[PDB]
Every structure is written in C-alpha cells, then in structure tokens.
C-alpha cells in the first residue's frame, strides 16, 4: 500500500524546468517521499486541469501570471513559491548588443505580443515600433537573430534566467519604463481544492513575502475585471513592515494612463499555523498555514487601489481597449 506524489507537466522546456525546480524543493523537505513526473501532451491549462479532476495527477506547476484570478471550482493554488526576478527584460539583436531601448535607432521594431508591454513601451518610447511576435522563448530568440525584422524583443527576466539565457538579458526594464504583469516571476502550484493531504505537503512551499505581494497584485487585478488579457500592470515591494503596491492601466497605444501607488503596514509573518479548513481561498490561493491577517490586509490593499483607479476612469480605459 504505497503512495506516490504524481506531478503533471507540459513537456515544453521552460514548463519542465519550472516543474523540476518545485519538485527539487519538495524532495529536500520530504526526502522520505516518492514523486512521479507525468508528461502529458492557452488550452494547456485546461488539460492539466482535466488530469487533476480525473485524478490522474496530484499537482501541477504554473507561472503564476498564467493563472486567472478566479480558478474553476474544485481547484486552488496551494503554494506560491519564492519569487524570482519579476522584471521585464529586453533582448537585443546581436547587432545591437550593449545598447538600450533609449539608444536604439529611431523606428526600430521591438517584438512583443503582450498588450501590457506594448502600451507601456509605446508611451515611453514614441520613436520605436512594437509589433506582435509569436512562439516560445527559443523560437522568439531565433526569429530575432535570423530574420531581420526585429531589432529587439521583450521577455520576462525570470524565463530567460530559468532557461539558461541569462547572458542575453540586455536590459532589465525599470517600473518607470515597463511595470510587470500580476504575479510575474512567481510559480504557483495548482492542486485539487479538497485534497487536504496534497495541500498539507505543498504548503511548505509558500514564501510569505511573495504570497502577500501576489495576493495584493491579484486582488487589484480581479477587482478591475482583469486577467492575462488586459493592459494592466503592477509593482510590489515589502520593506520595513510596509507593503507597497503600484498599479496602472493603459489604452492599447499607451496615450491614456492612470497610475497610482498605495501602501500599508503588513509585516512578513515568520510563523506557520494550522488554520481552519473552512477559511475560503483568497484570490484563488489556499494558505491556511500562513497567518491570515496579513493575507486579508494584502487583499484589501489590492482592492483599495483598484477602487482608486476606477474612480479616475479605469473601467473606461479597460472597456475601450477590450473592444479592440
Ligand atoms: C500573462 C502572460 N503570459 C505570457 C507568456 C508567459 N507566461 C510565463 C512566462 C515566463 C515568465 C514567468 O513565469 O513569469 C511567459 C513568457 C514571458 O513573459 O516572457 C505573456 C507574454 C505574451 C507575449 O508578450 O508574447 C503574458 C502577457 C504579459 O506578460 O503581459
């Protein structure tokens, strides 16, 4: 009568690397336990979810920014892992290595299929062109270097780092240039919402500071009626007992913009707990072993900033962008 922890992965390289980093952390906490990785084949979220409900697998690893602020019923995010670098990065064509976006020749084409990235970068760099680029990270790096269309592309720093492409990171974008997506750089572990055994085990992965930052960022996004699909961006930081949250929305061209910052006293809790089970998820995340007070406070900060943005016309900016 054995028990093996079954871990679902997409077989794509980056998804597989993320899965292994999490399994490695679990093995270190649970050396006496057995894990089995089950390769399978954004439809991919659906099918890995399908295997979870069909009980073919026990946990799957996502980039947090790829999960929506409300998960389908019967699933939850049981762990938010310690955040890697959240910043967007510029990769340059070999001809332009050493340059910045500030020093590219006028009318260079920058590749990105993110509405958030294009809107912010258009606003700050009027003399540049931004055009859609499709594919995974290696395919985008290929189309940048071999085809002569693009002079640069935008990618998450975290993804390049995980892929072993740290050296192609040419410039790391600051918040004044491009704020990042909600939950960028953090990994989220999705599990069956009722599965207390697996929820127990993966709970060891929660990093308190990352969990609180991502609750505030996801609550901001959810209250604005947003997902991966909208031109919304954020910056969070925890220092000296303060949780800072900057949030922004943009027209698809970046000409219209509301951006404000708010803060609150949330101390990063050092202790673990065994909170009650009937405590519901917060923005899709189950963290019963972290003190709940700081979580609720982070959720309120997100909501407060969304309300401030909405009172300055955010819903109009977002509804106008969506219809295009
Ligand atoms: C919301 C969104 N997801 C992606 C594709 C994606 N998802 C995860 C990563 C790696 C970074 C991480 O784990 O946080 C990536 C790739 C990347 O952002 O570099 C995108 C990118 C669409 C595109 O520009 O082609 C987005 C949109 C967004 O970030 O706003």
Author numbering: 17 to 57, 75 to 357
From the reporting publication:
In agreement with the ESI FT-ICR MS analyses of wt-hPBGD, a fully reduced covalently attached DPM occupies the active site cleft, showing a ∼120° angle between the pyrrole rings, instead of the coplanar conformation of oxidized DPM (Azim et al., 2014). The crystal structure only represents the Eholo-state and is denoted as wt-Eholo hereafter. The variability of the electron density quality as well as elevated B-factors indicate a dynamic nature of the residues Leu257–Val263 that constitute the cofactor-binding loop. Electron density is missing for the first 18 residues at the N-terminus and for the active-site loop residues Ser57–Lys74. Unfortunately, surface exposed residues in flexible sidechains, including Arg167, are not described in the electron density maps. Furthermore, both our structures contain two monomers in the asymmetric unit without indication of dimerization as also supported by the mass spectrometry results showing that except for minor dimeric forms, Eholo and the other enzyme-intermediates are monomeric. The crystallization of the wt-PBGD was performed from a mixture of intermediates, and the heterogeneity of the sample, as well as the flexible parts of the enzyme, such as the N-terminus and the loop including residues 57–74, most likely affect the quality of the data.
